[PDB]
Structures are given as structure tokens and as C-alpha cells.
Amino acid sequence: DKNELVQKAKLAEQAERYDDMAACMKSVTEQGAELSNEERNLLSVAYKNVVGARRSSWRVVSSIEQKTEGAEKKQQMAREYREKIETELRDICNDVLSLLEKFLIPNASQAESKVFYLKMKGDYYRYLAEVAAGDDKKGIVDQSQQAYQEAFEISKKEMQPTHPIRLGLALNFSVFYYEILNSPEKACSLAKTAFDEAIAELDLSEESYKDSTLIMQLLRDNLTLWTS
Template sequence: MPTVQVKRPVDRARCMLIAELAIEAERYQDVVSEIKKIVFAYNARLTVEERSLLSIAYKNLTNTLRSSWRIVEAVEAQTSVQATKNAKRRRELLLVRQQRHKIENDLLDTCNDIIDLLDRYLLLAAKPGEEAVFYSKMKGDYYRYLAEFGPEKDRKRFGETSLQAYKNAYKRALTTLDALDPTRLGLALNFSVFYHDVYKSPARACHLAKSAFDDAIQSLNPKTTAANPTLRDSLSILQLLRDDLVLWVEEM
């Protein structure tokens, strides 16, 4: 008689315990696997803590690949100069380029994984307001990484998709979130970085960053912010916005 497989419900607390342990151990793919179990079992309704772990995991996975790309790209530039008159260096240059292409494809796979999760599950289930802004910002972020470090032939398309995702997120943020909300400020920070790094427009980057910075400063009120649990996060992002503004103004 065949054995009947009984599908057990996903133990949410167990998944979170493993995910938190995996974060400490820097096993970010394990974090993704555990949070995905919750996404699929609970109709893509994540708590703030679950959402944060998912974000941290993908950020670290892509940060490693982006760092690797920069290193290999620097080696490629150096080898390219030496390869003009050296056959051995030309062979080395081909190998270095192959490694860069491999990193680009690994980044493409990782970014497509989180973008697919966002498009098919998380964004569809998101509540209007902070949650929807958070996920829309994530979509803009990972398309931005592809626009900078993905396969070169697709970078323009990735940049255009990133811009649209950021615009959608920012439109939602302006109408649903307070100017001092850390999710809105984090979006403004990343959106302005997009204009600077991808579209090479310090002017637009400065305009967006300064507008977000000024709106947040104007909304600071000792009576309403004293008990605000996210104030420290907001102030940290404001400092980053200010630092970027100083650098970008110098550029112009």
C-alpha cells in the first residue's frame, strides 16, 4: 500500500528562528529560503521583521556580487592597457572578461529572483502606504543594480524599469507617508543615487535629495517626534542625504 504524504503547515516561528540564526551566520541564501516559505504559506503577508530579514539577505547577496564586479572590472582595465603589445596579456584579458560576465549573470539571477518575488507575490499583497512603498522601492533598487552591473546590452532597459519603479514608489510615498518617515527618506536617498549613478545627473539627484531633506526638517516637531520610535533611523538617513548633497554640489 503506497505511503500517503501529509503536507505539514509551515511553522512560522521555526522559519523565523532559522532565518535569524542564518543572518547571524551570514548565510543569506538560507534566510531567503526560510522567508520564501512564509511568503508562499501565508499569502505573501510578511511582518515588518520578516520583511526586514528578506531585505537584508538580498542586499548582502547583491553587495557581494557588486563588490566582486568592481574588483574584476579594475583588473580588466589594467590588463587591457597592458594587452595592446603583449599576447600573454591578451589571453589573460579574455579570461578576466569571462569572469566579469559570470559575475554579471550571477547578479542577474539574484536580482531577477527578488524582482519575481516582488511582482508575483509581495507587491500584489501589499497594503497601501508604507508596505507598498517599501516593496516598490526594493524593485527600483534591484533594477538599479542591474542597470549598473548587469549585462551591458540590457542596462538601458533596466535603468528605464528602475526609474519607473522609483517614480511609482515616490508618488505613493508623497501621498501616504509623513516627510520624516524612514521608508520615504530611504526611498528619496536611493532614488537620488539612481539619478546620480545611473542617469549621471547630479542636478536631478540634488533636487530630489534637497527636497526630501527640506521637507523632513520642516516636519521636525519636538512635541510629535519625541516619542517617535523611528526617529533615529530617520535622522541617520537625513545625514546620508546631507553628505550626498555636499558631494554632488561640489561636482556641479
């Protein structure tokens, strides 16, 4: 089966063995069939954990590298370690991105799916951007932007303002603006617009209601943080 591979994925997950988890979901996806919701959520959880360890490590090693502007033999080591880490992080981003292009985005048969995967493309190009160089960065940044912007176009047309997926896109695209493009006014109004539109369209099913409000809280937390 491949139902088997999904069951293995869930095991891995319960064992907090995210590399295993990611390897299962990679092969499920590569079986070529559109993923169920559950599967989509397993794939994404898997790769978030795999990539988040490298991001988190990268920030530690970068901080150290720069806080030792005086030592040298150390700066040489930290730097080389940062870049070993960056290599892992890139290969990961590349596998996810390749998976999105080859399988997930083309077969996405619902708008809810398409948006989900497009946002995901934006996120992964975003992590590629955070660790970009001085001769690749604008290329990667525009890729991130374009994925978010198409996802954003579709969700605005196809989905309700309280849609947790539509809301989550707005949270991540606004973060893209603040951190990647250094456009805080832009990040702010993207987040504010998405919060207010959800406030207006309050009349939101019972299931989603619970993730919606939360994300709205996160939107407002970023707004207030970014003020002053």
C-alpha cells in the same frame, strides 16, 4: 510551521549564512501571506547581503579587467570571470524581482509596505542596470525609474516627510539619478528637497526619530560630496 522557517532564517542570520537566510525567507514569502514587518526586514537583509557580495566582487573584477588593457590572455580571463559573477548577480536580482511581482507588491496592504517594496523593485532593477549591456540597458533603467517614481508618488501622498522609509527612498532615487542617469542636478535637488521637507516637518515619533535624522545626515553627505 513557517514560523519555523522564520526562526531558521534568524539562526542563519546570526551565523552570517546569508544564502541559507535568503532561502528561508524566499519560502516564507512563497507561502502567500502578507509578511509582517519583521519578516520584510529579514527578507531584505538576506538579499542585500547575497547580492552585495556579487556587486562588490563585480567592481573588483571590472577594475582589474580595464586596468589590464595591455595583457590579453588575462583580459580574456578577467572578462569571463566578470561575466560568471554577473550571471550569479542577475539570477539573484531575478529571484528578488519575481518575488516582488508575484507576492509582495500585489498583497502589500499598507502604503508603508507598498512603498517599501516598490523602492526595493527600483533598487534591484538598479543593480540589474549597473551590469547591463548595450542592447538592454535602457529597458532596465526605465523599469528602475518607474518603480522608484511610483514609490515616490505614494510616499509623498501617504507618508510624513520624516518617514525613514520615505527618506530612504529619496536617498536611493537620488543615487539612481546620479549614477544611473548621470543627472547630478536632478539627484541633488531630489536629495535637497527631501532633506528640507524633513527639516520643516520636525514636529516625528520617538521610535522613528532615530533613523530619520541619520538618513537626513546621509542625504546631506551625498549633497556635499556631489558638490564640486
